[PDB]
Design a protein around this nucleic acid. Structure first.
Lengths: 102, 206, 49, 118
RNA sequence: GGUGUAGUGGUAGGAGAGCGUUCUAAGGGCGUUGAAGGUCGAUCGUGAGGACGGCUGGAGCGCUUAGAAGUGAGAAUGCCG
RNA sequence: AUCCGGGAGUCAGACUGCGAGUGAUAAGAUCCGUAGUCGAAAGGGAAACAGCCCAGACCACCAGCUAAGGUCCCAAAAUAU
RNA sequence: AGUGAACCAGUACCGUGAGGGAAAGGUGAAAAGCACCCCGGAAGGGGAGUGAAAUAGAUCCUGAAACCGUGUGCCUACAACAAGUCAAAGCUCGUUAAUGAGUGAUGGCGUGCCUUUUGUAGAAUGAACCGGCGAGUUACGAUUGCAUGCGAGGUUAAGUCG
């Protein structure tokens, strides 16, 4: 059973029972979420709808807000006696999937 | 401002009204910071020196030639970058003391004693008399007035038995009334001044 | 005021500038003097006027 | 009051050498060699975060071309067909379908073939 | 504090704000039930940098607020080993 | 934009359109005027390429649309009409 | 570092001479400084003992790096490599517990660092490597900004007691 959803600025493939990582959501851990836009409902027969499939949602539960591992961005110009250094860790949320549209 | 009076043991033998120009005048906090910093930089003995290039016991000869030897041009065995050479820009003997103008000295004295009074941290007592210089009796007196912190003991004059008895106690400092500084009052938690010494201080701070 | 809580007045003391201590401070490697010339030397410069 | 330069330089230098683990020979053991190599790696990693996003797009595109030529189309005609029908699948999901669910990929290729049949 | 809008390549060079070293004062602490130093780790912060744990080691050392500086090293056909 | 005040650095430039002199209407030559890029500018194109064509990097993404230049294979896209 | 010299230093050493001139501190609380045995010419070592500790044994506190070895998990004999970075199968492990750690066949991309230059990968300049040391300071004046006290006023110098 397949569904494809628009989350963040991207698209993900989805299934009942599996967990997904995603851009930060504005929902506290333990609460429920509804992904409104469904792109395709595969599985046995596919529903290939113009932009979205009419009336299908996907339900989940937020599990955890985290941070990714650290990236360092360092920049210098050879022979020009100058450099600049910066770090960065990225937020995410983890979501469990339950009941692709029915 | 009125403070309560005590005796070498007793109770509330009335009160004593002190000046309002000296003990009640709303302290000024930057003037006190300036006084403390000036006084602490005033106690230094800046006795420190080091040897520059020309004082090190060493050489005036050019050690090798200027060219040919496949070397680096050198000028003396005693250059700053040679092991054992002389120091560039070290410490020199210096002064460290300066003076603030006269009105702010007086303003800091008034302000620090007035702060002591505004929190019931000054304790007035009729007299401190002793027939012999005994430390034990001074400690009893000190507990008679329930004093359990660092204390400045401001005495009058040739009250020599009291100053002897109050020495050597590791919480106690002793000063006479013609020799109080700004740094003595700020460091102690309380002041134990006698009635005579209080009027004598009011006579010089005017 | 207690001797363990001192505070000068705001704007009254400033720190200092130390030249020749690395590139990122702004004044390493020639310490504000530009490239070569009489004004880049120790004791360099011309008399007043 | 003199300040010996005791233990600050060794800490900084040992932080640099720890980033050079796994390099070849004197490039993980000497401080100057490691310093230069680590600077070059910083440059390469910043460059390659941006080049990654191009590599996977070319990979997806070539797999989609391969799959579509099996359904009577090429990449450019099939993309036009999907746009004229208002379908908005990524090239990532399209390639994933092309490898896993050939029947879904054929459903989509038929919709595109009917769209540009007008 | 919210929300909008706009901005954020950089040599010479100007301006701002900080990190770390040693020493002084005041305060509150730790230590043979093991300080400083050394070595290893998969830890934290936007940067200089900060912790915690193991092993080694044997007597001193942090933290807060203010002060003072012989206060930071990769290069000089540098000097000593 | 103008006015007062604190602190500077620069006084060796280079190529490419365009319009003139010196030269032989030679030079990656030389000396002026006018516009841009480089200097002090990473990214795509030009095989490789300071100065030409497109475009100005605060940071993260295994999302999307285009510029100059391209779509038989190396090598992404038409063996298009 | 501090005197050239913390130690038998103006010494050893160098020069005909005048003169130039170093290096080199630390067992333990207490020598209790290893009786006896074994291999060995000896040096050195292994037991046994001293001692809180000997991997504190006289080259004796701590004991960093260059540099030299021994043992092993993973790779390597059709391959043109500024030595990494991004993508990635197989094998081996199991941590400050989290989108774990080591190695890595194979594929894309990619001409060190510093200085001086219109301009550098430069066949322009410097550096064998590792460690230590090694460069805008102070006195007195002049000016501007900030800060505090007094305000048509502001302030004392030498000196005297302390």
């Amino acid at each position: 059973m397949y569904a494809i959803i628009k989350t963040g600025g991207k698209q993900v493939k989805v299934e009942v029972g599996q967990a997904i990582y995603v851009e930060k959501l504005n929902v506290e851990a333990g609460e429920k979420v509804v992904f409104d836009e469904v792109i395709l409902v595969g599985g046995e027969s596919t529903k290939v709808g113009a932009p979205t499939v009419a009336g299908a949602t996907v339900e989940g539960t937020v599990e955890k807000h985290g941070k990714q591992k650290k990236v360092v961005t360092f920049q210098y110009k050879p022979k020009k006696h100058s450099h600049r250094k910066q770090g960065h860790r990225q937020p995410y949320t983890k979501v469990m999937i339950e009941a692709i549209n029915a | 401002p009125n403070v309560a009076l005590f005796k070498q043991d007793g109770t509330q033998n009335g009160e004593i009204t002190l000046n309002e120009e000296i003990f009640g005048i709303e302290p000024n906090e930057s003037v006190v910071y300036d006084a403390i910093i000036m006084q602490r930089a005033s106690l230094r003995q800046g006795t420190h020196a080091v040897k520059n290039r020309s004082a090190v016991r060493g050489g005036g000869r050019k050690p090798w030639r200027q060219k040919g030897t496949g070397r680096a041009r050198q000028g003396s065995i005693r250059s700053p970058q040679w092991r054992g050479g002389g120091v560039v820009f070290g410490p020199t003997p210096r002064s460290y003391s300066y003076k603030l103008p006269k009105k702010v000295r007086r303003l800091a004295m008034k302000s620090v004693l007035s702060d002591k009074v505004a929190e019931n941290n000054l304790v007035a007592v009729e007299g401190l008399s002793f027939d012999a210089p005994k430390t034990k009796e001074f400690k009893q007196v000190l507990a008679n007035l329930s004093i359990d912190t660092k204390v400045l003991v401001v005495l009058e004059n040739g009250n020599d038995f009291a100053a002897l008895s109050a020495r050597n106690l590791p919480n106690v400092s002793v000063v006479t009334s013609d020799n109080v500084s700004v740094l003595d009052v700020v460091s102690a938690n309380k002041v134990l001044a006698t009635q005579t010494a209080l009027t004598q201080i009011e006579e010089v701070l005017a | 005021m207690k001797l363990h809580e001192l505070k000068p007045a705001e704007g009254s003391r400033q720190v200092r500038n130390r030249v020749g201590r690395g590139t990122s401070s702004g004044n390493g490697k020639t310490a504000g003097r530009g490239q070569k010339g009489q004004k880049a030397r120790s004791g360099g410069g011309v008399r007043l006027g | 009051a003199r300040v010996k330069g005791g233990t600050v330089t060794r800490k900084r230098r040992k932080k640099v050498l720890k980033l050079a683990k796994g390099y070849y020979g004197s490039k993980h053991t000497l401080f100057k060699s490691a310093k230069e190599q680590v600077m070059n790696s910083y440059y390469y990693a910043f460059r390659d975060r941006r080049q990654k996003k191009r590599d996977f797009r070319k990979l997806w595109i070539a797999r989609i071309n391969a799959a579509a030529r099996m359904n009577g189309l090429s990449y450019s005609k099939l993309m036009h067909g999907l746009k004229l029908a208002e379908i908005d699948i990524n090239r990532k999901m399209l390639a994933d379908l092309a490898v896993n669910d050939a029947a879904a990929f054929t459903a989509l290729a038929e919709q595109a073939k009917d769209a540009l049949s007008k």
